[PDB]
Amino acid sequence: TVPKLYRSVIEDVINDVRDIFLDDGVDEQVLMELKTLWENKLMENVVVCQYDKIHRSKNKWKFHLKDGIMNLNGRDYIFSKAIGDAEW
Amino acid sequence: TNYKPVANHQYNIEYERKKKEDGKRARADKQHVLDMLFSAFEKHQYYNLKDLVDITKQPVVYLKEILKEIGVQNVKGIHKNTWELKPE
Amino acid sequence: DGLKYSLATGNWGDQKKAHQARAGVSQVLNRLTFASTLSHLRRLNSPIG
Amino acid sequence: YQLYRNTTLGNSLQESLDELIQSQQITPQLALQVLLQFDKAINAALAQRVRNRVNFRGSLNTYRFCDNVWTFVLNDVEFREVTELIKVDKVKIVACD
Amino acid sequence: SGIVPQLQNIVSTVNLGCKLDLKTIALRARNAEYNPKRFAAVIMRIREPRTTALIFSSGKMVCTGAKSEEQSRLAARKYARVVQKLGFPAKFLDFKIQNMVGSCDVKFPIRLEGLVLTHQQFSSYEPELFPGLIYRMIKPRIVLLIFVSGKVVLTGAKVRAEIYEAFENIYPILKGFRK
Amino acid sequence: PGLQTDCEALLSRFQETDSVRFEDFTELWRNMKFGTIFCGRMRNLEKNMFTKEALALAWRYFLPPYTFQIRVGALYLLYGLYNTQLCQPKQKIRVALKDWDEVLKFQQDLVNAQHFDAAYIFRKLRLDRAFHFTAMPKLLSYKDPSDRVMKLITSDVLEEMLNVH
Amino acid sequence: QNREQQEELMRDLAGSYMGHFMKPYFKDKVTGVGPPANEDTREKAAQGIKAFEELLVTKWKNWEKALLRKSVVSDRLQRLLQPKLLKLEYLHQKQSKVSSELERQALEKQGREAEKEIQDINQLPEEALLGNRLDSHDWEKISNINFEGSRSAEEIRKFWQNSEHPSINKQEWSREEEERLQAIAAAHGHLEWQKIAEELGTSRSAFQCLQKFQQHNKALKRKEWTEEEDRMLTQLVQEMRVGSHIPYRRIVYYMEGRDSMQLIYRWTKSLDPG
Amino acid sequence: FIQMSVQRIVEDAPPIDLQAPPRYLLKFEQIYLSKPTHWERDGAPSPMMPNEARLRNLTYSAPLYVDITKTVIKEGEEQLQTQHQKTFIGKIPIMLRSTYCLLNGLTDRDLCELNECPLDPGGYFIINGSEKVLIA
Amino acid sequence: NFPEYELPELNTRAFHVGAFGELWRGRLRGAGDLSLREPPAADSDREDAAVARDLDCSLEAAAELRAVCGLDEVIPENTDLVTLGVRKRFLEHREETITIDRACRQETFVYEMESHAIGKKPENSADMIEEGELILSVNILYPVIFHKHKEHKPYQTMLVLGSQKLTQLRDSIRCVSDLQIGGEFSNTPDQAPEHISKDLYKSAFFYFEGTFYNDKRYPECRDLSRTIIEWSESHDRGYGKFQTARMEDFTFNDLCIKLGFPYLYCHQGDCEHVIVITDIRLVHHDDCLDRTLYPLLIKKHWLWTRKCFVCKMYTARWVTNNDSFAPEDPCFFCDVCFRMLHYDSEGNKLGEFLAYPYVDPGTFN
Amino acid sequence: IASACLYIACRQEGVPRTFKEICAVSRISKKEIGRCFKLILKALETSVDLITTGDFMSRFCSNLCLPKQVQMAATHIARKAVELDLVPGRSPISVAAAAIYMASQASAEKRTQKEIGDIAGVADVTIRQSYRLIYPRAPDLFPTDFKFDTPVDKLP
């Protein structure tokens, strides 16, 4: 799912900037080179997400997190919702 | 069923919630406020204090002090005395 | 209060507009005899103006 | 939005754009425009093309809040995707809305 | 009686003695929050005495949450050291315990209605607004939330002796209304 | 569906006789034509389900907190129902365990009161093996009662009280 | 005893389901998710053994057949607009900082052209907007935004591409079309139904052509009983009876080329004394 | 007047249009009248008999309600239409022995039970306990 | 221990089954109520003597009791009672609304499953069950096969025998997750069928009130409960104090359970069945008396059967995903319509797809 | 200040309404009404007698279409319940709503928890909570001489 999502993002970005490349006067072969270079370059644990609600009791934290890309153990995972708990 | 018990009128909660979310009018560094004022001066010769506040989005007292430091108000016989962004 | 005031006093129009308010349209029903009650309920007024 | 341009996808994109710039095949103006389009695209993707809920439990080590960004550091955490467990010793969650 | 109230919270303040840039502290402290769209202070938490300090740009810190005077002084000094290490000229001036919330349980249900009827000039009992009776003690300026379950929450004191004498004043009154 | 009404009707017509003799229950059985409560076309499944319901209901009335008269009536009802069934593998009366020590003392009180009709009826039920000795009645998933005051106070208790006084 | 009866009444008032003990029998009291998968579960999934919820099929309702069309149309519009929208925004950004006039006028002209193209795209008709039943849309998006998650990405994709595209003739068959299908499949061999759907001329799916062929086949069932087949049927019935209950739909799946109705007729009319 | 004129007056009133830019509309459609009611100190409504109005110096008035439909547009291609059924707008003095009077259709015996004279013709209003007649 | 309602009418308290059976066999010890024999003028005298001995009466009184308490169809029914009148009305309304009036297939099915083995005598009389054997009427909830099975949970009830090892029930529960064939057969569908999942993943476990009876009988068996006990040894999760056992050193008579309370049976990785001990009763003389067949099926659900999606005449043998011919994504086929749609002339797959063999749950279950 | 004064006057006259019956009329939230109410009692150095359950009954049972018999019934139930300490420390309005619900389900005209919640301004959950507290003691609260068509021995 993570590689499929990444491929979707790559294809969207390439499809949406094609016109700018055409406009400013750089050939679309540079665009395909960008796409293949990106796909090739594609091959600490950090979770980059958005927060829907960080609620906190006296010590108990409850995170409701939105769209996120985590990097756990060198492996990228994707989530649309992460409901985590913690105790400070 | 008229004037039937409500903990709060719906309009009251909506407006109060909006004001809380929109939160605070931060006082930006004089330099940033000055730059915005001068940049907007090109659009029109004269501005109203109330309208100028919305464009600058700064406290009225703080904005007035900045405006007084450079700007002045000219008495106009058509509507009323209004502030002129030109210091001279 | 508007309908009550006009019926209570016999003045027609708003209270503040009593200058042009018609007077005497509403009167206390005459209960002296049954005939006077019947007549009062069938009374017709011809304003001069 | 400058948040997702730290992940492996965004890092790879920045590196590819730098390789294209140093090779004099593209201008930095178009490069930053591509980066902005990428931010919009990845937000739309993660919002629309992704539906899977994880649940994690850990012992929040530290936290921080500034300019609308939470920075949690959790220790001995277990993330729980659909059916699989992912246990990590320490994880930094940088959340921003 | 023999029961004394347990201090549950102690609010104290201190003057650090120098103006602060809250953004710096919120970017460099370990558990700080800074939402200047919600409040105008840096909210630091610690674990050892389990206290919360709101640090203000004027330099005035508010350490709450401790369970004793000494723990509160130690916590305030801890936050002082924290802001010190962040490169600020912070000192420890004018530490003052501004509030002490103690709680207790007299261990018998109470008749609030009778109590407010006989003590109308002190107590305020509005069951629509709060399920507890609010007794404004007058000898020490203490406020007691007295409940039908017997729990009594004393609050508003600057010194522990005030909490103790307030509960000693209020205990016979409640014993008079033992449900 | 209306069965409990007929059960209550028979038990009431019985208790109104203030009798314990089974001959009276036979007279009511033949009078009410109660045995034809099973007569009528119905296939095996619904037939034995209805029989289950009827036996469980009669047994429920056989136990406390019902009067002795109602209880003997319900025992006779159980005999008459279990003995007149259309099911080929006759349905059995579900006896919980917690109720066995009460049914035994009830049988003992019956034979002590020389009510040999009802005691013989219960013996006939136990010999024909008409019981499923379960753990709980009503497989699990997912009136005329007796008062405590008569167990407390009655004629002889107050008599001994006034004698001692 | 009476106070215990009262407490039993109160615990009845304070008593409470069975759905809570379904497929994930164990679950957090915090998050409500089961324990991780066993090693047997992972090994089973590796072998491609479909779980029950993966083989779970649901019919395509009519409002879904409408939502799909509206959503594919909307997604194609967005996909076609995004490039030109970005180009227009980029032209505006270059106009904002150009420090020139004649170049600014050329940029305004190019912006007029871009807006005209966006207008042509907005006025594209539905037919050229749908596509050609083999072009990729964001089917992960339709499965989450338009459908609330009730249909997976590949489910929607195959239903749209293979069945519900308007380039699939869904009209009723004609006698001549059925006869041409018969003649082709007989000549073409009954095994290349893609080339049969193509050679049929009318825009059909291979699935629809095979479906019509079967529903009008005659060698589908055997239509005549043999003694070996009677012995098989008898041995099967005697094995899967439970009494007077003879499940013929379970019996058929061991009889080769029969339908349960044929088994009923045989075991009723020609295999009981009776 | 009660059955037709009041409803026509409310119907013929132009809808209230207000602009902020959110736009607000108010449309009044249906008019309801309750029987003459009096509200006690505790606020408990009760039917008001004409004799009680005469004795206690009350006004024989019936509550007036109007169904109000409110539509709001916020230039966001969304329209919210909320209707407030039976919105209290005032009380109309009631002419005695009229279709909207409590003494309507009551038999002569019923009127005597209410301490009302059957020979009383009605046709007047009780305004603060005073029987007021409207002269043509 | 005595079974008693923990919940008002839903659930009992945890009680040992062996102790309960012993209480019962103790209260009926040598009273002649547990016979398991078939029901059989000289006998009249012996009977009367027995009644006189048991009721403390005379032989004459005993004969009198025997005479008076004697026993005291025909579709016609008149002079009705309440429920008899309701039945007459129902019968008449059915006589006018129905035209064939015979037992529906589900009625005959439920009956012929329930009464499948009643009074079936053991052929050996060495597998005869002892007098008092505590048959437990378990019912195993089907997994969620069809989507609607979440709402009304279908179950199959089994008359397990008390004092009969666990794994005598684990080997008896018919679940289709034991018959699934692994691997994908798209390239060639004539492959030697990989061993059914019954052989590959032999592990399973019962969970009865905080104790995982694991089936470690075979070497291919691994501890499925290890995952749960580890998952609970971590952060507190409500659950706590989990036990283990071996499920071959245990019989249902050694088990300490509640009645009507849901317990677990996990097999084939995560095919979970909710086990409910509905009731426990001493064995009667009118039910099956064998042991060679006793963990027997009282009721099963009669699921639906999937059919080939092309022609609806045969059942589904195959399920294909990502099929470049199928309108639906998971498309089920018979063998004929599968071979005809995907394979050119010799087994070369046409187009692209992932074909798996499909065991119809409504057929092997 | 006007809303708080209105509430204080209604309470002083002896026909008290609830804050939810003044917020329903005023343009401000009940929170501000209560705040200014306490502030006014503090400033004026006056007090107001404590509300009882029998004050909200002549109005709640009349806003509902209940007869006078059911009204005196619920009055008696509520007064006895606060007498017998079945509802400790719970607001008189919720006890009034619970008692009215009991006397309504017992008598001829039945009313659900929803209508009584709308009238009394009490969440139906609170009606449940304070009805379960008087649920077991139903009969000895009712008036002795009380006619009804639904047996007081069976109530939800």
Ligand SMILES: [Zn+2]
């Ligand atoms: Zn299974």
Ligand SMILES: [Zn+2]
């Ligand atoms: Zn087929």
